[PDB]
Curated annotation (Swiss-Prot):
Keywords: Decay of host mRNAs by virus, Early protein, Endonuclease, Eukaryotic host gene expression shutoff by virus, Exonuclease, Host cytoplasm, Host gene expression shutoff by virus, Host mRNA suppression by virus, Host nucleus, Host-virus interaction, Hydrolase, Nuclease, RNA-binding
EC supergroup of this enzyme: hydrolase
Organism this protein belongs to: Epstein-Barr virus (strain B95-8) (HHV-4)
EC code(s) of this entry: 3.1.-.-
Matching InterPro entries: Herpes_alk_exo, Restrct_endonuc-II-like, Viral_alk_exo
UniProt protein name: Shutoff alkaline exonuclease
Amino acid sequence: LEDPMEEMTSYTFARFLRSPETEAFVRNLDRPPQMPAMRFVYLYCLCKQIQEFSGETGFCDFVSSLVQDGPSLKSIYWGLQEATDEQRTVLCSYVESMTRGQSENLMWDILRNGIISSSKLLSTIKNGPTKVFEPAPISTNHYFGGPVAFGLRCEDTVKDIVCKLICGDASANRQFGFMISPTDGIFGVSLSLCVNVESQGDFILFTDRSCIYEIKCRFKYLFSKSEFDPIYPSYTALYKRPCKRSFIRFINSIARPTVEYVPDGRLPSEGDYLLTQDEAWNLKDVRKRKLGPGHDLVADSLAANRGVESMLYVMTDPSENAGRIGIKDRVPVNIFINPRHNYFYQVLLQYKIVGDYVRHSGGGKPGRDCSPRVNIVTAFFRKRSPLDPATCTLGSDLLLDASVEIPVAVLVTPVVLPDSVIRKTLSTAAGSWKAYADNTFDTAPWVPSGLFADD
């Protein structure tokens, strides 16, 4: 009779918005029900139920201290309407710490209904928000066996490298819950890694020396230390002579390369998410022109980013080095991000939401700006040779999981994000939310006027 969360799966935001109890107070409101308030009331109600069989009363006691047997939804909707942003962001990071442990849990899912997640922002812009008001499958998790299993299996080791090697410290928060954007209650984010975060016992205090790191492991670049493998040669060349020239040949050793040469004022394709205008990278052809016609957004971003220089890190080969994976070399390179690609959006929301936390959490210094830095780590692995030692340490002393493949390169790319671009993007996205909420509810909650479209 155990797993009471298997039961709470009917109590999604959408459903709450459709409750008779909901409708109760929204009848006797003056205004179209406002929206972060509505989301926070829902959260309070889902908690009131959950807290029983999970003991953690904490979220609710906060909501309670805001209003002065349980208080009536009108008392609650109204104290949440009057709350200061700090107080909002507290509530959000109650929900964050409340989910930190288990991305596997079912609550992670119930919370995701009605929230434009960051992975789904570009899709949501292009196709609209219906998938965002829809249940999410088993996946499975059983015998995963391919690109997506490669993803999960490694996305650890790459944090180990980022934390320990790239910035000199392994004491960094790697587990992140679900972070609702506190000021809007519409968007959501889950961080991969983020450096310079501090604690409050259960809470994670983002400081303003925060660095976000989106991790991607390029499965299409997997290869073996073995004659006949096609990438291997161009790689041993990289190893021995690390630099732009060598690395170009590596990037280009597969059918579909991950960097794309697109010259200033041309529109980039969509292949994937790295671009470069640096000439050395140019071996054939011509590009549609990216102008006026809408491309204004991708144009402002392209401009802001094509000055960005990324760092390549060439790792030492564990086999040639008594099992040591250290930073052998540090080639700087001229590669930046594809503002057309899915990731650019995912990483823009990750930057917008954390900005918000950082700001309204004890933490902003007048005169100075607290937007974090964002980067995309693009990790290159090879397969395990028979030659490689059974055991391996990153650096001197960090074990490396025996199931994981060998890290070979790591390419970190700063992302630059004009407030210009953020405002519109999120804005046309949130009207899309409104849009659907309007003819699915009856009482659609009104969007905060800071995601209002225009001036």
